[PDB]
Amino acid sequence: PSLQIDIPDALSERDKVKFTVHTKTTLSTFQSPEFSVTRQHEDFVWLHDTLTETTDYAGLIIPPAPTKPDFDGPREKMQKLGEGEGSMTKEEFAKMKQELEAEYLAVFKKTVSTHEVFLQRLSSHPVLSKDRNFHVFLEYDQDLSVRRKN
């Protein structure tokens, strides 16, 4: 209960999916008792691969990386839904928009779950929860793009 993480919300923008990573901790090894950051799916992938390529960690039961969420389908339907707004009736536009939202909702619930469980499993691991890069993932305010390139 010293390190608790959750994902209260998520966002699909273009081809990127952003997760809000919310952390409540009693550990003074973190600068703040409560904080939130924004992380893309790529950051989760980077976190996992960084742990596995740490030679000291080789052998540890490392939880599997969350798989890439698939929004290609819904994104296509949504935009093509959008073009036909003028042409489309004002009665079925909300019909299959609500059906589109439901399609997004199904994908979101699943991928948020996989991403959250991944982080929660890392928090309960006696070795991995103290990792420097895991710390950065949870606490570092700015975008991880540059630290993923160096």
Binding site: D6, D9, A10, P74, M78, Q79, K97, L105, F108
Partner: peptide, 21 residues
Amino acid sequence: EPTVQFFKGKNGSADKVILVT
């Protein structure tokens, strides 16, 4: 072009998505 925003449901509320304008 637009973005879709997801919100986890709290206090028994249902999770939902919002098509952002």
